[PDB]
Design a protein around this nucleic acid. Structure first.
Length: 262
DNA sequence: CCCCCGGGG
DNA sequence: CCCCGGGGG
């Protein structure tokens, strides 16, 4: 629904002045618009308490989902602030996946930095990242060998079509031990658990947007997201060789490079 | 040219 | 799962 706040933002981002033939710019504006949405909802304590009441059904849904994903109670929160994250530096794997942060201050004067990753999409799964096989292996903790070569095969072919059923099963098998580290690294840029580090996202916010309009929002903390993907990857088909991620290629440049949807 | 944000069939 | 595109640095 185009609530008071969302209307204000669609107007601010001039989303309606964009011709329904300008998909490119419309996607950038939306992506930026929906980051603002989260930022505004958590702009400060006044905003948070305001948007968490039943007077704002939608914002309340969003904020509840966020707080629930962090297992925080609105009553324990004394102050809040939010901002766009822009560190200006890369790390092992490239730029940090943190798009913005939210800082909660509780009663005892302690606080919680919550780096976020926010995307918008009309689909269930969307691109989460692209990497060269070497970076991935380095980040996940996979050394030269059978596993790396099978992955590099995927990279060069830009899919698994040239693989044999034996090789697909084989890849799924060798990867089984690295599943979680793999998933967590793809989306956070770190194989192990993290919390409050502005360099690695704690929550993954996915806005389901169809025909330019808000539909719903999903907010997962990393542990849950990983579980979901692990489960999804345990099915008979074994999506993403067990990772629950969609392996494909980055059409981005000339060098063969892998892309992961999740 | 490369990376990040996306999608269709 | 396989095949791709727009925008901006």
């Amino acid at each position: 629904m185009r609530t008071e706040l969302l209307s204000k933002l669609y107007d601010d981002f001039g989303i309606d002045q964009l011709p329904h033939t300008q998909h490119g710019v419309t996607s950038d504006r939306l992506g930026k618009l929906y980051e603002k949405y989260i930022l505004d909802i958590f702009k400060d304590i006044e905003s948070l308490k305001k948007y968490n009441t039943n007077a704002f059904p939608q914002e309340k849904d969003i904020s509840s989902k966020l707080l629930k994903a962090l297992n925080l109670d609105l009553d324990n929160i004394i102050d809040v602030s939010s901002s766009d994250t822009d560190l200006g530096r890369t790390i092992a794997g490239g730029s940090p996946k943190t798009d913005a942060t939210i800082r909660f201050t509780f009663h005892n004067q302690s606080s919680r930095l919550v780096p976020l990753n926010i995307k918008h999409s009309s689909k269930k799964k969307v691109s989460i990242a692209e990497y060269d096989v070497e970076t991935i292996c380095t980040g996940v903790g996979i050394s030269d060998g059978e596993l790396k070569e099978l992955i590099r095969k995927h990279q060069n072919d830009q899919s698994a079509k040239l693989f044999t059923p034996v090789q697909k099963q084989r890849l799924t098998e060798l990867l089984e031990p690295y599943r979680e580290r793999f998933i967590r690294w793809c989306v956070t840029l770190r194989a192990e658990k993290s919390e409050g580090n502005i360099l690695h996202p704690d929550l993954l916010i996915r806005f389901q947007v169809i025909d330019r309009e808000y539909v719903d929002v999903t907010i997962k903390n990393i542990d849950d997201y990983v579980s979901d993907r692990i489960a999804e990857g345990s099915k008979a088909r074994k999506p993403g060789f067990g990772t629950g991620l969609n392996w494909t290629y980055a059409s981005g440049s000339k060098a063969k490079k892998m892309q992961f949807k999740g």
